[PDB]
């Protein structure tokens, strides 16, 4: 049941990531990456496993995550795809650091 209470905290962490408090830098991660946008024609060639916040929420509701570490692996996969595809100086990379900082600070205080 320790795992069950951890997965409940994962939902609250993702809820804060969806909150308006962070919407100024968390919006590029709400929905899956729109590969039909200009300049993103080579995203599926660089990123082999896409991941977004809506997919993480869908798998939380479907209870696909066994433990909280599998949840964090997808959250960090979401940020790693941004670090790998986008050049470092881009603004979206800076937005990923701000949202990941919010995640890592909340994820570190997981009940144990």
């Amino acid at each position: 049941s320790k795992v069950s209470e951890q997965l409940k905290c994962c939902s609250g962490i993702l809820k804060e990531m969806f909150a308006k408090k962070h919407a100024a830098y968390a919006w590029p991660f709400y929905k899956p990456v729109d590969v039909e946008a200009l300049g993103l024609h080579d995203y599926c060639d660089i990123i082999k496993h896409p991941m977004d916040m809506s997919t993480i929420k869908s798998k939380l509701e479907a209870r696909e995550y066994r433990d909280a570490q599998e949840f964090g692996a997808d959250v960090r996969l979401m940020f790693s795809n941004c670090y790998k595809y986008n050049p470092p100086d881009h603004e979206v990379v800076a937005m990923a650091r701000k949202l990941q900082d919010v995640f890592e600070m909340r994820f570190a205080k997981m009940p144990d």
Binding site: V33, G39, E91
Partner: peptide, 14 residues
């Protein structure tokens, strides 16, 4: 103007 991940728009300031 601003462009992020193919999304281009004009801010309210400009």
């Amino acid at each position: 103007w601003k462009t992020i991940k193919g999304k281009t728009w004009r801010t309210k300031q400009c």
